[PDB]
Amino acid sequence: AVPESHRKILADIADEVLEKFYGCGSTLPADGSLEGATVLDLGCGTGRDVYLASKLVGEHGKVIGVDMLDNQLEVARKYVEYHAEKFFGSPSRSNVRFLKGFIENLATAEPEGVPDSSVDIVISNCVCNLSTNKLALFKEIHRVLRDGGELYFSDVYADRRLSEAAQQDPILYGECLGGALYLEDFRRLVAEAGFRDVRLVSVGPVDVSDPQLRKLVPDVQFYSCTFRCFKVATLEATREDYGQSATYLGGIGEEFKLDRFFTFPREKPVRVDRNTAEIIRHSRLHQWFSVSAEQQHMGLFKANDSYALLHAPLSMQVEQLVS
Ligand SMILES: [Ca+2]
């Protein structure tokens, strides 16, 4: 937890914001990739993650938080000036705002709604499983994102379908296990929402130890997954070879790790499927990459040392890439 680069910025953030923040922090993409981005944190709380992003996006970027806990927002809302001077030398130069509303309908949040195609990166940590309608949440994320933008988030998933009994249990529900999707049900739902290519960034195990809770979910394996789901018009459901290479140019780290299949060393050409090329080309990432032209179609993409897993269901990717 807590990368070194963030550590200094957190030391700067108002102690009331940190003391009262509920939850784990939203993980963020590589810091350099955030410059100038518009970022939205679903379930922002006291604003810990909003304020951290504020600094990293710089003065041209902007950050929006949403949440419906009155108490937590009121804290967030009154340290705007604080952080605008601590990051940007004047108290009237804040690049952030907090909105009150259900994450399921961003359009009706207060002061203002989040308009269509206005956001580069949507972040959240552990909001979906406590959510009332997952599909409507995902559809709404897709609405607010611009082309090339991404949902970059962490949640709890399961390696199989939970029983109605487990879904009804209030302790399980509250731990965000009860509402966990089977990963394949997840992949289909999110695709029905418009996101056709889901990329695994990292995965951790989650254990249920308490013997009676465990009895509702006997052999179920839960995982904490961070996924990134780009909104890019040209993506297909399959990962197809059109003979391309991408080359990370430098500037935002020694190397760029797109997901658990694709790592790009500075100035070394790496062969890529066309989905991966389109993500690079239409996302903010284009700035730090060179992507070669589409040739003739060559079949499914195999020029990767884990290609069989690359095409396998999410379930197999996750379980293999923990162990
Ligand atoms: Ca949060």
Q: What phi, psi does 309 have (nearest 5°)?
A: -70, -35
C-alpha–C-alpha distance, residues 146 and 106, integer Å: 15
Please check whether residues 182 and 317 belong to one and the same domain: no
* C-alpha of residue 43 to centroid of ligand 1, in Å: 5
> Which residue's entry shows tokens 């994320």?
141
Please check whether residues 215 and 300 belong to one and the same domain: no
Helix H segments across the chain? 4-12, 15-20, 48-57, 70-77, 80-88, 134-144, 164-168, 170-174, 183-192, 211-216, 274-282, 307-310, 314-320
* C-alpha of residue 125 to centroid of ligand 1, in Å: 5
Please check whether residues 203 and 245 belong to one and the same domain: no
**Looking at the DSSP assignment, which residues form a beta bridge with residue 202?**
226
Query: Resolution in angstroms, to 1 decimal, for this deposition?
Result: 2.3
> Which residue's entry shows tokens 């390696």?
159
Please check whether residues 233 and 290 belong to one and the same domain: no
* C-alpha of residue 151 to centroid of ligand 1, in Å: 14
To the nearest 5 percent, what fractions of the chain are helix, strand and coil? 35, 25, 40
CA-closest candidate to residue 41, choices 157, 136, 121: 121
Which H/E stretch holds residue 49?
Answer: helix 48-57
Q: How many CB atoms lie within 10 A of CB 159?
A: 16
Q: What phi, psi does 262 have (nearest 5°)?
A: -120, 105
Q: What is the CATH number of the domain that holds 302?
A: 3.40.5.100
CA-closest candidate to residue 200, choices 322, 82, 75: 322
* C-alpha of residue 165 to centroid of ligand 1, in Å: 28
Q: What phi, psi does 81 have (nearest 5°)?
A: -65, -45
Please check whether residues 196 and 266 belong to one and the same domain: no
C-alpha–C-alpha distance, residues 62 and 114, integer Å: 13
Q: What phi, psi does 33 have (nearest 5°)?
A: -70, -5
What does the DSSP assignment read for 177-240? -TTPPBHHHHHHHHHHTT---EEEEEEEEE---SHHHHHHSTT--EEEEEEEEE--TT--SS-B
Amino acid letter, residue 77:
R
Please check whether residues 312 and 197 belong to one and the same domain: no
C-alpha triplet 226, 227, 229: angle, nearest 5°: 155
C-alpha–C-alpha distance, residues 124 and 103, integer Å: 10
What domain count does the chain have?
Answer: 2
Where does a domain end: 208, 237, 266?
237
* C-alpha of residue 23 to centroid of ligand 1, in Å: 6
Q: What is the CATH number of the domain that holds 189?
A: 3.40.50.150
Residues 6+ apart with CB under 8 A from 14: 51, 79, 82, 83
- Residues of 133-146 as b/e, b for ≥16 C-beta within 10 angstroms? ebeebbbbbbbbbe
C-alpha–C-alpha distance, residues 249 and 266, integer Å: 6
Q: Are 322 and 204 in contact (CB under 8 A)?
A: yes
Please check whether residues 27 and 84 belong to one and the same domain: yes
Q: Which two tokens stand for residue 98?
A: 């907090």
Q: Are 96 and 51 in contact (CB under 8 A)?
A: yes
Q: Which structural technique was applied?
A: X-ray
* Full residue range of the structural domain in which residue 244 is found: 238-323
* C-alpha of residue 252 to centroid of ligand 1, in Å: 26
Going by the annotation, the residues of the binding site for S-adenosyl-L-methionine are 22, 67, 72, 103-104
Q: Which two tokens stand for residue 93?
A: 């130069």
Please check whether residues 84 and 158 belong to one and the same domain: yes
CA-closest candidate to residue 43, choices 176, 241, 192: 176
